[PDB]
Subunit: 62 residues, 2 copies
């Protein structure tokens, strides 16, 4: 199994689901589903999230 | 940057793009684009690919 850590990293970086969705041109629902691990980003989307949160993309994977 | 290693692992495991596409219910074009790193699987798709190739999903990420 492989999940993402976007919810934890968002909190650590003091950012919201709304902010991330706006930066990525995606719906807040999409981001929320990634955060809850109900659905998953593609690897390229994960890289963009990491760039936006100023972390290594490896840190977004569990 | 983050890419996938599906093309290398397919070759190592003696499997084809066609086989993988058939197992995943996806088009061969989709798999070929993952193999060439022109597009990327979601994390859950990567887990299914890893299961099918009998590898740890971590081995599919570069």
């Amino acid at each position: 199994m492989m999940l993402n850590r976007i919810k934890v990293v968002l909190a650590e970086k003091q950012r919201t689901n709304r902010w991330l969705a706006e930066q990525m041109g995606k719906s807040e629902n999409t981001i929320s589903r990634w955060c809850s691990n109900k659905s998953q980003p593609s690897l390229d989307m994960l890289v963009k999230v990491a760039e936006l949160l100023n972390v290594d993309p490896r840190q977004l994977i569990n």
